[PDB]
Design a protein around this ligand. Structure first.
Ligand SMILES: CCCCCCCCCC(=O)SCCNC(=O)CCNC(=O)[C@H](O)C(C)(C)COP(=O)(O)OP(=O)(O)OC[C@H]1O[C@@H](n2cnc3c(N)ncnc32)[C@H](O)[C@@H]1OP(=O)(O)O
Ligand SMILES: CCCCCCCCCC(=O)SCCNC(=O)CCNC(=O)[C@H](O)C(C)(C)COP(=O)(O)OP(=O)(O)OC[C@H]1O[C@@H](n2cnc3c(N)ncnc32)[C@H](O)[C@@H]1OP(=O)(O)O
Lengths: 357, 357
């Protein structure tokens, strides 16, 4: 198994959203990932289950439980993404696991956390980010907030903090001999993910008004613009020098414009930039600003990404199954990840135990 | 120093965006983090620079270069986020560091990658997520894409993958006795962050049309709703049992609505939910649905977060310098993080070498 995490052993209790994602990235980086699902559920067609061995096991039977504790005893990391109390009642809780393996990294992935008034409340991404200020800050000012898919609570503020916790605990274990419990709550991870805004708010550089900020779409130089063909470019020319280069490429004389950061005149600046970008198509601007520091890029739909030179040449994607999927990230000079293995048809939990003795 | 990364030594070549966020988190979890800025910037209110020692050094000079190469010699990790070729030309490239410390994790944080046609273009978050299909997918169907702040490219798809690569490489160094180069590019990280959508596209369960999918605001049961007071709730009632609980709380009989997943009749369903949510204020809905699985939560503004019971009790935030800031994530049972230390005055680079033996 290729990658920096070769020989890491991971048991994943099947859930949804962050847990599977974290487990995927471990697999991607060459960890040995065994996913316990329930027998009620051919080859699974969710490519988020790549780089896994899938076993079934009724964890409510005494046999399925025992079989599971046998895996966990042979493993470095356990991931679970159920409401609190769930693993405990299965007899798979942190304390039961410590009995069969005091070295285990016990990784708990929730939205709301392990305790507290909301800890038994069902939820999805959109809910975890509603409570901590994040969702309110996203979208245009004249409109209701828009969910940034499930990228911020589940993955960015969720799976990724679970991973940072699993791997920091493994480092700590190198010196202590011992495992421990990682409590990764989406409401917490996503708040750290957005620490920059909390910092900026303290220094009066961010307001709670939606659509009135440097990075939320309010700044005319950090937003998308519609082009003559109805497609879009993104402009991100925060630095004055990059901003100047953008104006020149648009054909606009800086002298006739309001200042870049005179916020009172932003509506006026935006009207001028809107008219300029609308006068040619997306691909024209892509060509004009190639090799430039103007921070102007075409906004590609998923279906066009495979045709973009910079994407093709770094192999950010590989072809699979129905189509393209992202190659592992990040990349390693010496112990390079390899292409993911497709979702690996159900194997028998005994076989795995033989393999791991 | 409290936390799982106690004893980890980190050298950070001062930059912007992901690199400082990654460095912040390492420090958050107990790492000993030393930040080399240029003296050209000598004065900090940026609470992203918490858990840090700051030092000055003209790396263009001979003395600067040598003092930096000494710190790097005595450290586990180097973080840099300059364009490719910068550290090489400065004499702090991977090869030069390898000659003074072959245990070093050499962590390279860019947007576009170390090579390829865009590898030298300036950019920010909005640029990196524009090329890989992400930005096009965010926002309402009848409007241009809206940036999800800088959450998806800088942090979730940037710093967080940097952290995972650093920590994965540290694990690997337990076997090999050798460091390596981590190449974290925001266009790759963010692509893995959205792997779900790439999977779902392959199986026909996600389209390239903005605002017409399950998780982008197109589903009436996964979206925000405006209330009587002009504030908002979030609805995330994906599973039919949670949807049913929401309907009951709204006072709508299932028998009068279209089916939850009859997409052709989503216009009607949205109209019905819209009218219902509009009939009371946010805080009313917050009360009705506390302790429910209805997946309905108030959309709070930053400024209101500190009064939410569940946030207070879990101490998701701490006070510092006229404003709240997030506590470290995730959480650790045995080697818990401590409250971050604020930015300090600059320290002498000699005194750091002295302290580090
Ligand atoms: C691909 C297209 C589909 C769309 C994807 C969905 C959207 C993306 C996800 C997000 O946006 S994050 C959303 C999920 N939130 C979390 O994961 C936070 C923590 N988890 C939860 O809050 C709950 O797991 C959740 C609300 C998601 C679902 O609640 P359930 O009540 O279905 O499950 P719960 O976690 O409470 O318990 C699972 C049950 O399965 C049982 N179980 C688990 N594995 C088993 C096994 N192998 N055999 C037998 N039983 C098993 C477990 O024993 C337990 O039984 P109990 O009835 O005794 O409590
Ligand atoms: C701080 C204000 C508020 C923050 C708002 C912005 C936050 C949002 C951030 C985002 O959305 S991600 C944006 C950043 N993108 C990246 O970080 C990807 C990789 N970095 C880059 O693409 C470039 O660094 C960047 C476009 C951000 C800036 O380009 P520059 O052309 O200013 O720097 P470049 O990387 O080429 O080189 C850095 C320079 O500093 C010099 N340098 C650095 N540390 C030095 C030192 N200590 N002493 C002397 N010289 C030093 C280095 O020599 C070199 O100068 P020279 O070309 O003149 O040699």
């Amino acid at each position: 198994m290729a990658g920096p995490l070769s020989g890491l052993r991971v048991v994943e209790l099947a859930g949804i959203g962050p847990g599977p994602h974290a487990a995927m990235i471990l697999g991607d980086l060459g960890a040995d990932v065994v996913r316990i699902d329930r027998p009620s559920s051919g080859i699974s067609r969710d490519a988020m289950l790549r780089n896994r061995r899938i076993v079934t096991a009724d964890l409510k039977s005494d046999q399925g439980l025992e079989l599971a504790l046998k895996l966990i005893a042979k493993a470095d990391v356990l991931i679970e993404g159920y409401r609190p109390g769930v693993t405990e009642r299965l007899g798979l809780g942190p304390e039961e696991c410590a009995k069969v393996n005091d070295r285990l990294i016990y990784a708990r992935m929730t939205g709301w956390g392990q305790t507290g008034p909301r800890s038994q409340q069902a939820g999805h991404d959109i809910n975890y980010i509603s409570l901590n200020g994040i969702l309110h800050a996203i979208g245009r000012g004249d409109e209701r907030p828009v969910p940034p898919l499930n990228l911020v609570g589940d993955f960015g503020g969720g799976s990724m903090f679970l991973l940072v916790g699993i791997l920091a605990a493994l480092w700590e274990r190198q010196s202590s001999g011992k495992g421990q419990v990682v409590d990764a709550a989406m409401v917490d991870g996503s708040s750290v993910l957005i620490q920059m805004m909390w910092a900026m708010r303290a220094t009066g550089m961010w307001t709670d008004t939606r659509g009135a900020n440097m990075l939320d779409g309010g700044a005319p130089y950090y937003d998308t613009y519609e082009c003559a063909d109805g497609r879009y470019v993104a402009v991100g020319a925060i630095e004055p020098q990059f901003y100047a280069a953008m104006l020149a490429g648009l054909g606009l004389d800086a002298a006739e414009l309001p200042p870049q950061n005179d916020r009172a005149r932003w509506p006026e600046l935006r009207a001028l930039l809107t008219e300029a970008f609308a006068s040619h198509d997306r691909d024209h601007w892509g060509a004009v600003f190639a090799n430039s520091d103007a921070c102007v890029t075409p906004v590609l739909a998923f279906g066009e990404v495979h045709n973009e030179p910079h994407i093709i040449e770094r192999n950010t994607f590989y072809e699979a199954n129905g189509g393209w999927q992202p190659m592992p990230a990040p990349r390693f000079s010496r112990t390079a990840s390899s292409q993911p293995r497709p979702p690996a048809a159900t194997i028998d939990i005994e076989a795995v135990l033989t393999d791991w003795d």
